[PDB]
Amino acid sequence: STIEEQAKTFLDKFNHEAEDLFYQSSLASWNYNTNITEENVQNMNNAGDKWSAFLKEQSTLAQMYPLQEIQNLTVKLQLQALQQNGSSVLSEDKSKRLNTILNTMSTIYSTGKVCNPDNPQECLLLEPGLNEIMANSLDYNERLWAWESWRSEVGKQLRPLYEEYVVLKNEMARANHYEDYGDYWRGDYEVNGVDGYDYSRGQLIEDVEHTFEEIKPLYEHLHAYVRAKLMNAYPSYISPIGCLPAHLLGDMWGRFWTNLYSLTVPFGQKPNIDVTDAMVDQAWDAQRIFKEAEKFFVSVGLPNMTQGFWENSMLTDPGNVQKAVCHPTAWDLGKGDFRILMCTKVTMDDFLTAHHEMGHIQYDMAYAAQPFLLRNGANEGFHEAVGEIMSLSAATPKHLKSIGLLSPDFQEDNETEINFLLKQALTIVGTLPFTYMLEKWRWMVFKGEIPKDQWMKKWWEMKREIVGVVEPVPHDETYCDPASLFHVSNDYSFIRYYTRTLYQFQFQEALCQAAKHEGPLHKCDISNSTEAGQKLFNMLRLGKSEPWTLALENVVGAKNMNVRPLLNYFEPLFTWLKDQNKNSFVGWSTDWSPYA
Amino acid sequence: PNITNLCPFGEVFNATRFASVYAWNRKRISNCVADYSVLYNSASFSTFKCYGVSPTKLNDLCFTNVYADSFVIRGDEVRQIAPGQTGTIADYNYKLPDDFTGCVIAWNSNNLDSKVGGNYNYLYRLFRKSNLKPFERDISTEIYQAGSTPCNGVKGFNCYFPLQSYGFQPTYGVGYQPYRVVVLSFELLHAPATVCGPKKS
Numbered sequence: 001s002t003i004e005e006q007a008k009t010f011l012d013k014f015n016h017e018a019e020d021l022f023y024q025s026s027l028a029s030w031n032y033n034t035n036i037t038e039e040n041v042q043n044m045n046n047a048g049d050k051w052s053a054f055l056k057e058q059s060t061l062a063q064m065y066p067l068q069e070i071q072n073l074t075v076k077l078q079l080q081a082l083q084q085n086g087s088s089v090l091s092e093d094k095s096k097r098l099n100t101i102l103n104t105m106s107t108i109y110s111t112g113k114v115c116n117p118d119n120p121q122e123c124l125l126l127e128p129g130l131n132e133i134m135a136n137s138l139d140y141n142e143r144l145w146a147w148e149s150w151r152s153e154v155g156k157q158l159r160p161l162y163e164e165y166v167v168l169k170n171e172m173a174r175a176n177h178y179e180d181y182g183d184y185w186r187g188d189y190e191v192n193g194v195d196g197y198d199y200s201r202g203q204l205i206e207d208v209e210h211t212f213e214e215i216k217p218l219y220e221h222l223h224a225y226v227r228a229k230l231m232n233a234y235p236s237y238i239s240p241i242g243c244l245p246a247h248l249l250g251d252m253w254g255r256f257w258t259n260l261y262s263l264t265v266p267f268g269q270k271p272n273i274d275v276t277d278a279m280v281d282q283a284w285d286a287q288r289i290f291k292e293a294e295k296f297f298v299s300v301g302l303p304n305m306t307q308g309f310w311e312n313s314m315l316t317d318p319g320n321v322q323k324a325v326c327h328p329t330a331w332d333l334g335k336g337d338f339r340i341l342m343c344t345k346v347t348m349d350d351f352l353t354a355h356h357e358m359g360h361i362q363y364d365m366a367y368a369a370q371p372f373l374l375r376n377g378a379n380e381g382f383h384e385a386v387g388e389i390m391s392l393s394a395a396t397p398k399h400l401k402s403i404g405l406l407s408p409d410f411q412e413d414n415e416t417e418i419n420f421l422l423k424q425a426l427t428i429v430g431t432l433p434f435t436y437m438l439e440k441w442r443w444m445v446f447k448g449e450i451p452k453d454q455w456m457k458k459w460w461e462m463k464r465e466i467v468g469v470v471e472p473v474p475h476d477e478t479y480c481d482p483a484s485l486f487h488v489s490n491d492y493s494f495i496r497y498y499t500r501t502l503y504q505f506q507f508q509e510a511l512c513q514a515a516k517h518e519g520p521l522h523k524c525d526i527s528n529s530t531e532a533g534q535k536l537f538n539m540l541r542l543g544k545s546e547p548w549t550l551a552l553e554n555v556v557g558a559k560n561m562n563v564r565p566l567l568n569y570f571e572p573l574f575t576w577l578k579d580q581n582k583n584s585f586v587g588w589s590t591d592w593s594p595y596a
Numbered sequence: 597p598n599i600t601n602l603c604p605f606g607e608v609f610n611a612t613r614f615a616s617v618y619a620w621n622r623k624r625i626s627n628c629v630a631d632y633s634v635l636y637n638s639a640s641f642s643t644f645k646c647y648g649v650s651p652t653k654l655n656d657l658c659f660t661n662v663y664a665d666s667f668v669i670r671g672d673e674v675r676q677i678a679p680g681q682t683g684t685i686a687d688y689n690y691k692l693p694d695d696f697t698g699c700v701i702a703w704n705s706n707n708l709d710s711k712v713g714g715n716y717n718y719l720y721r722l723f724r725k726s727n728l729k730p731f732e733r734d735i736s737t738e739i740y741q742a743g744s745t746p747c748n749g750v751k752g753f754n755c756y757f758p759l760q761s762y763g764f765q766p767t768y769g770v771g772y773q774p775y776r777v778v779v780l781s782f783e784l785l786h787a788p789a790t791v792c793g794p795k796k797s
């Protein structure tokens with residue numbers, strides 16, 4: 001009869017067909033990932049093509065129901081999700097060119113091999129060797145060679161490709177009634193039609209700047225401390241008044257500072273909280289790791305893993321004969337099937353990763369009841385944030401003592417808390433200016449604020465201004481230095497990490513206040529607390545049915561992303577860094593004082 | 597006296613194939629001895645919810661006829677086979693009356709009714725114009741008209757095929773795994789009641 005009832009029956013038909021096709025595609029992808037064989041690659045490709053074709057057909061059918069004659073919020077949300085053209089609005093020649101450009105950038109990044117001139121007989125792929133040279137070397141010119149050679153080869157190959165990419169994506173986005181491709185990416189956080197809980201695409205940039213302005217003193221103090229320690233490690237290269245050299249940050253791009261923990265440790269003499277040897281001594285299998293993670297999730301009140309999960313998951317490396325992807329991934333196949341693919345080793349990192357991925361699985365299980373198009377996170381930030389909170393809670397010494405992995409006579413003094421917080425800051429605080437600067441640069445490139453002849457002059461200017469990282473030697477416009485990173489070269493949004501980082505500590509404060517923890521925030525463990533699990537599960541069960549602002553109200557009681565829980569988390573470290581930076585100069589100069 | 601001629605419960609419960617919920621099989625059981633303790637004390641059944649009568653006194657009472665309806669549904673939909681419920685199975689596939697006397701028995705059949713590629717034999721009716729009356733069977737395969745336009749027999753915009761398939765795969769979760777459901781309906785009519793329980797000697 002009415003348009004709304006017609007759309008509701010259309011969505012019911014779509015949901016039924018979609019679940020089946022999505023399961024077939026997911027199962028084929030699982031078969032490929034667990035078993036890298038040519039037959040699987042064929043089956044995966046075929047199912048993926050069928051799924052994409054189905055989603056084109058159904059988007060075309062979905063557009064015939066006008067949005068303004070539907071009043072139910074859930075039906076309108078699913079129809080809005082399904083009526084997006086995507087690349088379909090663009091012409092077939094340009095669509096084929098865009099797909100070809102994306103595929104060739106994927107191949108150039110994945111199969112990019114660079115080695116030293118005059119010794120070309122064997123080269124180094126980025127993932128095995130180049131990463132290791134970046135994370136473990138202490139030699140200035142070796143790291144400089146690796147950094148400059150990889151940005152020379154990869155950037156000089158990818159610069160015309162990226163120039164075509166920005167124009168095609170902007171054309172598609174303006175064809176889709178967006179200002180630019182940056183507005184298309186910012187549309188994930190857009191909430192429209194809810195009274196009070198509306199969020200705009202333009203509000204995201206303002207909120208990110210407002211939060212980063214509060215991030216800036218902590219990052220300045222951390223940067224000053226890291227600068228002083230790197231000055232100790234490399235005596236003459238680093239200036240007391242200038243920015244950090246780009247190739248010395250412990251990673252290829254400066255994404256994380258977690259590989260500088262050895263150089264910048266506060267109290268080396270004090271022990272670490274490494275529990276690897278304790279699990280080796282007690283013979284902890286990967287099955288025991290996942291069972292302990294399941295015990296953690298049942299302690300907080302969440303549902304335990306399905307029998308299917310245990311039977312169908314691959315939690316150990318299969319062997320030499322069978323090839324599998326080593327990256328840990330939580331798979332929501334659909335139709336009640338939840339699996340984890342992890343080549344679990346006996347390490348602390350794998351144990352924390354098991355908690356993180358099982359948190360991903362718990363979110364998927366919680367939102368499974370919701371309709372197919374709404375089975376996702378409320379935004380891109382929440383889904384990762386709910387795994388990161390489990391990683392936060394499991395890493396605490398209280399959790400390790402509770403499960404027996406740490407000695408009950410381990411002394412928790414202030415020095416161990418300081419060095420643990422510094423490690424967490426190098427992982428978490430250090431990625432925030434890099435993430436914000438990268439997204440702001442991409443937004444300005446898509447918006448047309450930066451002309452093509454001024455991309456790099458602005459980019460380094462942004463990096464000096466925001467990240468406090470200086471280029472080793474100046475780069476002209478023949479280089480494409482941003483696209484050397486995985487996410488930007490392969491068409492991925494990057495603000496999810498910034499939002500995830502803030503949501504992580506907001507959720508942590510909310511659950512710790514629920515659990516009545518009375519100490520420091522980093523000492524808080526959410527095990528044994530039914531109320532914390534209930535507060536989490538109320539948001540987890542919603543999925544994408546409700547606005548992310550309303551979900552954030554459900555957890556933390558705020559309608560917007562907030563930066564104060566992160567600052568509260570690192571407050572002991574913030575006071576310690578302020579004490580340690582009395583003699584040194586906090587802040588940096590954008591001039592070429594260290595090296596250029 | 598000495599009792600023989602037990603009721604054919606082997607041909608209902610231990611059947612090689614079960615019907616789809618839309619076209620649920622009904623077997624009328626008459627003129628035999630129905631031993632209900634064999635079913636109740638079995639460990640093979642996941643649901644044995646009896647409405648209107650208790651399982652303990654089933655082996656004593658006597659009924660005119662017994663209707664055994666058999667179908668396969670997803671596990672999550674097992675709850676819908678009850679008086680007063682709502683959902684796709686109850687509105688469009690199989691409706692139980694509120695004044696229902698009988699037992700709803702279900703058990704997981706993942707071993708027998710799932711295939712790796714998917715078992716598409718089992719179907720349910722996604723759409724019907726109106727809800728079903730109690731104990732009604734709809735086996736029509738006419739195109740559902742959700743819009744003002746006539747369907748004219750061929751699928752298209754706002755016209756959908758009524759029957760959809762649960763593609764059961766063994767890897768599915770418990771909610772989506774195939775469950776075989778046998779509903780026993782007990783009625784007493786003024787005719788002589790012949791389905792009686794076993795009498796001890």
Ligand SMILES: *[C@@H]1O[C@H](CO)[C@@H](O)[C@H](O)[C@H]1NC(C)=O
Pocket residue numbers: 035037039322
């Ligand atoms: C992995 O691949 C081989 C070759 O196709 C196959 O024989 C084997 O059964 C597969 N194993 C699993 C667990 O899928």
Ligand SMILES: *[C@@H]1O[C@H](CO)[C@@H](O)[C@H](O)[C@H]1NC(C)=O
Pocket residue numbers: 008072073074075
């Ligand atoms: C929206 O539709 C769903 C069914 O898809 C219904 O359960 C819900 O109550 C509706 N919401 C409103 C506000 O009408």
Ligand SMILES: *[C@@H]1O[C@H](CO)[C@@H](O)[C@H](O)[C@H]1NC(C)=O
Pocket residue numbers: 063083084085089175176177
């Ligand atoms: C998708 O593209 C078609 C054809 O250009 C257009 O009519 C329709 O309005 C588009 N839908 C959206 C949501 O932009």
Ligand SMILES: *[C@@H]1O[C@H](CO)[C@@H](O)[C@H](O)[C@H]1NC(C)=O
Pocket residue numbers: 304305306307
């Ligand atoms: C999950 O918990 C329930 C209730 O405690 C239990 O019956 C079930 O066996 C558990 N699942 C597994 C796989 O052990």
Ligand SMILES: *[C@@H]1O[C@H](CO)[C@@H](O)[C@H](O)[C@H]1NC(C)=O
Pocket residue numbers: 414415418576
């Ligand atoms: C730890 O506490 C002792 C005792 O108050 C103090 O002397 C020391 O400076 C503290 N160290 C840090 C890193 O806070």
Ligand SMILES: *[C@@H]1O[C@H](CO)[C@@H](O)[C@H](O)[C@H]1NC(C)=O
Pocket residue numbers: 299398402527528
């Ligand atoms: C949580 O509950 C379990 C079950 O008794 C207990 O063994 C564990 O010690 C508790 N955790 C804490 C931190 O007390």
Ligand SMILES: *[C@@H]1O[C@H](CO)[C@@H](O)[C@H](O)[C@H]1NC(C)=O
Pocket residue numbers: 605606609610640
């Ligand atoms: C059906 O099969 C089960 C399992 O083999 C068996 O125990 C039972 O006696 C059979 N018959 C009935 C009526 O349940």
